[PDB]
């Protein structure tokens, strides 16, 4: 999209504050510069010579033109057989970012046809509109009023019915949109509706690679590999996603951003971020000792204040429908009534 | 004394199990990453009534209407109503005109249906099942005086412990209300918490949470997830200058980067 | 049992009412056969 | 089987009850059993008068009412319950003799060269 | 409201809130950290045992 366009710009938020903290702490100046791409950065094999080389935040640190990798750089074993680490500062796990009759009818006749009979019943025995709006005010609430009383009880225990399984209808079968984390046998198998999907060239990736156990994951993961996260954002807002691997408390503010966005119940690979640092330096010892003096104390209570801490029934479900149906029908009988104006 | 006297006096090589980390152990050791994640902790034990409004006013002004074309339901007509809201069969005034018939049939099944609902909304707050938290965290107003409530409350930590070297590093008065609080044994604050002799505990997190998870009952509740805490990790603490660091390191990443861990 | 958990998944609505209403229909005739009883008296 | 049979019972007590009711203090000696098992129900089919009437159709009322909460709880007993038909039962099925036997004429076989 | 709520939380005794009657296996975490209430054993000198 644009090759080379690079401008100053402001960058706040948590890592800036951290490094101020450090210059306030320490005894020296920075510059803050961004990388070239969206990627941390994979070991792969360039095309000549049969090499695996590396890119992105790695592939600029041991290039020497950065210094300090000031990001949440994922703590793994292949990283830190080349550079040296520092404590970690977050620590977090995984998480899936997700979105969140014909009977009455029946019935209806049915006491239309004992309403019907029950009338030839009074004919038949030694007054029509009476026993009308009679049986009006029996079906919703001498050898007739048996068969009404029967039918009392047949209209208390056919309600008794509907209460009881309209109660079926909305608490126990609810569709599960929740995935309950790994352990879903739908995304153990996968297909073309559970869209699982992950950052291109993440060290995700490199941790499912290792487990070779769910290498179909890795197969189906590549078919949908996104540059940035807020790519995988936008088409999940879209309804173009279904399910995205990240890490817990990104996923969190996000969901303290907008509501609608949901983790998933899992806490698996409960791991910590650091500092991406080089080797062997007197930028170490120092370092460490900041970094744990920040830990002591109520800063990181702080940083959770700044963006971390901070956040951003009904009966409404299927009866604004019936209360509408309920207004339409007084209106449409509105217009019978005027035939009983016209009537009498 | 202890492992730190073991091992900074060079008696043994390096500590494995479990210890706390802070700046004067970092100083005197080199601890190894951390590997398991276990902080501190502390144990304890509108518009629709709108709208019903609105529509009950149009059901009695069309009754009303109706019952001026065609023998006291003039200003009457809100009992009958409201009490066939609540379906309930009270006595009110025999019904006789037809729009007010079957009208008031179609809102009496409305009701129905909204108390039916209304049974719906009562097992949904039955099925979801409270968990009241009275202690947010460090930062409590219980936390600054228990004079403030008339029950003055107690909580107390281990003896001879780097919680109490953590508190009197960031409150001293804390340690000072403590000193009247202190006790000895772990098993021995468990049963005065389970018997009532200890209202809460100071304690790390992961050994409350495995001690809660094997409970009779669960009846101590914890707090949070070390949200308002410390939430620091362990590490594996070896001298200053052992060339085995990054060995055990490489094998910790392994361990971790597996699922094994 | 490892490897059975391994290679074996171990899994496991709508309304319908027909034996009540069945008994709603059989006890209606019932109720339709008395009152044919008592037409003649 | 035997609720109905005690409830019928304690039905023509209460109409003796209140056929003692008329006969101390009015058309409503054998329309006890109407009005009764209207207002078991809670119908509103067009009134109790007499004292030991009101206190007796109030405890038989209330005790309506937790028959009515009892039928819920066998309702929602019922709704826990979720069963499955089988059609065979195994190897002695009455379908491995003919299918003629049965309208439908259904079929099953194995695997070609196979130990089955 | 009084005799909604007496059906609701009747509903509620009686429906959910069922003692756990079955252990459901080895996995009770009850019987991992057994006490004198739990009695369970087996056959003494049993393959069960070994
Ligand atoms: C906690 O540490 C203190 C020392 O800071 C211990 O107090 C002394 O420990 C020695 C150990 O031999 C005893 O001989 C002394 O008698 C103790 N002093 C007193 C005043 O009793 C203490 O034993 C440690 N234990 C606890 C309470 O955690
Ligand atoms: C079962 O095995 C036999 C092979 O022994 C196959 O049946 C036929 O066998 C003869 C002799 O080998 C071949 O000439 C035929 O071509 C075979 N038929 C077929 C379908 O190829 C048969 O392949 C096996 N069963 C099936 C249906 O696969
Ligand atoms: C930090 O380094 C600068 C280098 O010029 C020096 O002037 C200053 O005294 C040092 N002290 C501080 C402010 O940390
Ligand atoms: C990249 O390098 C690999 C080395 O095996 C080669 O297979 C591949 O074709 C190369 N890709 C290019 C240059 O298109
Ligand atoms: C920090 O840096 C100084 C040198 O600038 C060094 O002497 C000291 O040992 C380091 N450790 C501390 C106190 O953090």
Same mark, same amino acid.
């Given at each position: 999209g644009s090759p080379r366009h690079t401008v100053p710009q402001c960058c706040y938020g948590f890592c800036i504050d951290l490094l101020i903290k450090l210059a306030r702490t320490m005894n020296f100046t920075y510059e803050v510069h961004l990388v070239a791409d969206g990627k941390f950065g994979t070991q792969e094999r360039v095309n000549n010579s049969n090499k695996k080389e590396w890119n992105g935040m790695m592939g600029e640190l041991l290039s020497g033109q950065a210094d300090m990798i000031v990001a949440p750089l994922t703590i793994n074993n292949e990283r830190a057989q080349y550079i040296e680490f520092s404590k970690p500062f977050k620590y977090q796990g995984l998480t899936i970012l997700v979105k969140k009759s014909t009977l009455w009818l029946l019935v209806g006749l049915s006491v239309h046809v004992v309403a019907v009979?029950?009338?030839?019943?009074?004919?038949?025995?030694?007054?029509?509109?009476?026993?009308?709006?009679?049986?009006?005010?029996?079906?919703?609430?001498?050898?007739?009023?048996?068969?009404?009383?029967?039918?009392?009880?047949?209209?208390?225990?056919?309600?008794?019915?509907?209460?009881?399984?309209?109660?079926?209808?909305?608490?126990?079968?609810?569709?599960?949109?929740?995935?309950?984390?790994?352990?879903?046998?739908?995304?153990?198998?996968?297909?073309?509706? %559970?869209?699982?999907?992950?950052?291109?060239?993440?060290?995700?990736?490199?941790? %499912?690679?290792?487990?070779?156990?769910?290498?179909?994951?890795?197969?189906?993961?590549?078919?949908?590999?996104?540059?940035?996260?807020?790519?995988?954002?936008?088409?999940?807002?879209?309804?173009?996603?279904?399910?995205?691997?990240?890490?817990?408390?990104?996923?969190? %503010?996000?969901?303290?951003?907008?509501?609608?966005?949901?983790?998933?119940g899992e806490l698996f690979f409960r791991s910590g971020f650091g500092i991406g640092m080089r080797k062997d330096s007197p930028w170490k010892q120092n370092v460490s000792l900041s970094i744990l003096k920040s830990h002591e104390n109520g800063f990181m209570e702080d940083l959770d204040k700044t963006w971390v801490r901070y956040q951003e029934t009904l009966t409404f479900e299927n009866m604004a429908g019936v209360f509408m149906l309920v207004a339409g029908g007084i209106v449409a009988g509105i217009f019978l009534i005027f035939i009983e104006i016209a009537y009498k | 004394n202890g492992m730190i006297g073991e091992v900074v006096y060079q008696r043994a090589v390096m500590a494995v199990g479990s210890l706390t980390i802070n700046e004067e152990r970092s100083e005197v050791v080199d601890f190894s990453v951390p590997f398991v994640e276990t902080g501190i902790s502390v144990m304890v034990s509108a518009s629709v009534w709108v709208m019903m409004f609105v529509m009950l006013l149009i059901v009695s002004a069309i009754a009303v209407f109706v019952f001026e074309y065609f023998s006291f339901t003039i200003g009457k007509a809100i009992w009958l109503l409201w009490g066939l809201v609540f379906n309930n069969s009270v006595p009110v005034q025999n019904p006789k005109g037809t729009t007010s018939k079957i009208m008031v049939?179609?809102?009496?099944?409305?009701?129905?249906?909204?108390?039916?609902?209304?049974?719906?909304?009562?097992?949904?707050?039955?099925?979801?099942?409270?968990?009241?938290?009275?202690?947010?965290?460090?930062?409590?107003?219980?936390?600054?005086?228990?004079?403030? +409530?008339?029950?003055?409350?107690?909580?107390?930590?281990?003896?001879?412990?780097?919680?109490?070297?953590?508190?009197?590093?960031? +409150?001293?008065?804390?340690?000072? +209300?403590?000193?009247?609080?202190?006790?000895?044994?772990?098993?021995?604050?468990?049963?005065?918490?389970?018997?009532?002799?200890?209202d809460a505990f100071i304690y790390d997190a992961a050994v409350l949470n495995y001690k809660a998870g094997r409970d009779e009952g669960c009846k101590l509740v914890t707090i949070g997830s070390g949200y308002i805490f410390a939430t620091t990790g362990y590490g594996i603490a070896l001298q200053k200058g052992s060339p085995w660091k990054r060995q055990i390191d490489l094998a910790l990443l392994q361990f971790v980067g597996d699922g094994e861990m | 049992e490892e490897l059975e958990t391994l290679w074996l998944t171990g899994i496991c609505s709508s309304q319908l009412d027909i034996d009540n209403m069945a008994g709603v229909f059989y006890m209606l005739a019932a109720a339709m056969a008395l009152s044919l009883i008592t037409f003649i008296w």
């Open positions: 009979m029950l009338y030839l019943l009074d004919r038949f025995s030694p007054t029509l509109s009476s026993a009308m709006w009679f049986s009006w005010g029996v079906l919703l609430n001498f050898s007739a009023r048996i068969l009404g009383m029967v039918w009392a009880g047949f209209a208390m225990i056919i309600v008794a019915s509907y209460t009881a399984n309209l109660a079926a209808f909305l608490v126990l079968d609810r569709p599960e949109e929740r995935i309950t984390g790994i352990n879903d046998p739908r995304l153990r198998n996968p297909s073309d509706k %559970f869209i699982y999907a992950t950052v291109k060239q993440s060290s995700v990736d490199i941790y %499912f690679r290792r487990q070779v156990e769910l290498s179909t994951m890795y197969r189906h993961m590549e078919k949908h590999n996104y540059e940035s996260a807020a790519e995988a954002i936008q088409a999940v807002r879209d309804n173009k996603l279904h399910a995205f691997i990240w890490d817990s408390a990104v996923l969190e %503010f996000e969901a303290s951003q907008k509501c609608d966005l949901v983790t998933t | 049939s179609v809102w009496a099944f409305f009701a129905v249906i909204f108390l039916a609902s209304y049974t719906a909304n009562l097992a949904a707050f039955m099925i979801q099942e409270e968990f009241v938290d009275q202690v947010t965290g460090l930062s409590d107003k219980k936390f600054q005086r228990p004079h403030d +409530y008339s029950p003055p409350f107690r909580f107390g930590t281990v003896p001879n412990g780097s919680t109490e070297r953590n508190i009197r590093n960031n +409150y001293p008065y804390m340690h000072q +209300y403590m000193t009247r609080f202190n006790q000895r044994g772990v098993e021995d604050a468990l049963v005065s918490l389970k018997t009532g002799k200890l | -």
